[PDB]
Design a protein around this ligand. Structure first.
Ligand SMILES: CC(=O)N[C@H]1[C@@H](OP(=O)(O)OP(=O)(O)OC[C@H]2O[C@@H](n3ccc(=O)[nH]c3=O)[C@H](O)[C@@H]2O)O[C@H](CO)[C@@H](O)[C@@H]1O[C@H](C)C(=O)N[C@@H](C)C(=O)O
Ligand SMILES: Nc1ncnc2c1ncn2[C@@H]1O[C@H](COP(=O)(O)OP(=O)(O)O)[C@@H](O)[C@H]1O
Length: 439
């Protein structure tokens, strides 16, 4: 694409916005940047030559633009941005910019949960094959920072927000891993509107990898000739459950005994299937892909054991930012004593009620905090405490911890009401676990 002489406006002064500022400057275009936040995190990091506007969207700048580059954190439905669309002004996001420049095949991964795990797995499969791979997107490394004419494969984690503003993606292989309620504060037409954003990932994809156990991951015209499936008991890629042993299978053929994996849990085994399906579609050698499944140790903040000491496991599952991911932590969870469960933060208008079925019995205690703390405590008031902050919750629960207990941060919420990012929330939990979980 060519942006020469164009009036370019970037919305968002976070990680994405800063990456877009650098992208345009490097091609001889000086953009202007705005953010509705009064003091956005990227303000101090912005080059001094770049005009900025904070505290609102600037309608003079938007209506004057030739191109609006929207960070995923601003809604297209924002009245100012919607007005610009009505006027026919082109609106794209960083992923669109990336797709216009990328010169290697793209594997693209979305879904309500499991995205970073599958994304990282496909990256590891590529590395094991000796492929120069770039791994980025919603996982936390802005996609534009990956651009390299020597890159041989890109693996992108994509959010529904990024997909809304992307039109030029033609993935070699794309998946929606699952669709469960999230981001309802951004989707006033509910679950199907959210799903519709994710379904954009399949447009012009060479191969679509769908979840046989989740009908919402299928295109609305249904599965077509492009469409490879994974699942538990059914699918092209599926599991074989016999004698306390689990295997990954592809069309009836065993490919991996999951005892060789470092990850565990059924959802991680289906994550492995999806990763393998994507890698196969991208043409990566099967042998090295299977090897990568056995070397991968997991990601920080994803059911991460940060301390196992004095008979207590302290688990940082800070990446459980919606109900589906906390459900994945709780479903079939084994705890010898009491589960001390930390819930709270920005609930994004979620219905928390599906969690209630996991919170029965005499061995569960809830410690609820942050913006939507009260809504979480309401799941089962008789076993719940509410505090303002996670630290207060941790200091309240710690004296009650007994050998055999588990302390689990799996908050079912976003972190931005109180934290810089979910990593900061996880790191603060780990620091506090180390303090409070030792004599
Ligand atoms: C909200 C979102 O899409 N965040 C992703 C984004 O980070 P970045 O810092 O650029 O975000 P942003 O677009 O500046 O938005 C951050 C926050 O600022 C708010 N915001 C943003 C712009 C603005 O004008 N006004 C405003 O209030 C947003 O509502 C949001 O609460 O780009 C990064 C690189 O692609 C991602 O790693 C990061 O994923 C985070 C982990 C995330 O929470 N993603 C959501 C989608 C999710 O995983 O559920
Ligand atoms: N297939 C799945 N279904 C539901 N939850 C999952 C799945 N895979 C992982 N999770 C849980 O979701 C959270 C984040 O998963 P992750 O791989 O980081 O993806 P995402 O990038 O979608 O948040 C973690 O708490 C993890 O335990």
């Amino acid at each position: 694409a060519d942006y020469q002489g164009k009036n370019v406006v970037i919305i968002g002064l976070g990680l994405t916005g800063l990456s877009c500022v650098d992208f345009f400057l490097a091609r001889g275009v000086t953009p202007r940047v705005m953010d509705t936040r009064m003091t956005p995190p990227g303000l101090d990091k912005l080059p001094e030559a770049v005009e900025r506007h904070t505290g609102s969207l600037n309608d003079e700048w938007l209506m004057a633009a030739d191109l609006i580059v929207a960070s995923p954190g601003i809604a297209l439905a924002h009245p100012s941005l919607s007005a610009a669309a009505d006027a026919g002004i082109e609106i794209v996001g960083d992923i669109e910019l990336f797709c216009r420049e990328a010169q290697a095949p793209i594997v693209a991964i979305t879904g309500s949960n499991g995205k970073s795990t599958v994304t990282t797995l496909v990256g590891e499969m590529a590395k094991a094959a000796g492929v120069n791979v770039g791994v980025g997107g919603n996982i936390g490394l802005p996609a534009l920072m990956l651009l390299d004419d020597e890159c041989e494969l890109y693996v992108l984690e994509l959010s529904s927000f990024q997909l809304e503003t992307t039109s030029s993606l033609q993935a070699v292989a794309a998946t929606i891993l699952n669709v469960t309620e999230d981001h309802m504060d951004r989707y006033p037409f509910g679950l199907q509107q959210y799903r519709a954003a994710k379904l954009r990932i399949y447009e012009n994809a060479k191969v679509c990898v769908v979840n046989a156990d989740d009908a919402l991951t299928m295109p609305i015209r249904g599965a077509d000739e492009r469409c490879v499936s994974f699942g538990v008991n059914m699918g092209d890629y599926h599991l074989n459950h016999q004698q306390g042993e689990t295997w990954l299978r592809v069309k009836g053929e065993k490919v991996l005994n999951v005892k060789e994996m470092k990850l565990s849990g059924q959802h991680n085994y289906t994550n492995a299937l999806a990763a393998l399906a994507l890698a196969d579609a991208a043409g990566l050698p099967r042998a090295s892909s299977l090897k990568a499944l056995t070397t991968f140790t997991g990601l920080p903040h994803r059911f991460e054991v940060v301390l196992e000491h004095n008979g207590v496991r302290w688990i940082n599952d800070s990446k459980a930012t919606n109900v589906g991911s906390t459900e994945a932590a709780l479903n079939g969870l084994h705890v010898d004593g009491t589960l001390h469960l930390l819930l709270g933060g920005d609930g994004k208008s979620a219905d928390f009620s599906p969690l209630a079925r996991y919170l029965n019995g005499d061995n569960v205690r809830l410690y609820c905090f942050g913006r939507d703390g009260a809504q979480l405590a309401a799941l089962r008031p008789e076993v719940a405490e509410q505090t303002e902050t996670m630290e207060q919750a941790m200091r309240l629960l710690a004296p009650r911890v007994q050998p055999g207990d588990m302390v689990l941060l799996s908050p079912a919420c976003a972190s931005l009401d109180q934290f810089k990012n979910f990593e900061q929330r996880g790191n603060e939990f780990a620091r506090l676990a180390k303090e409070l979980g030792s004599h």
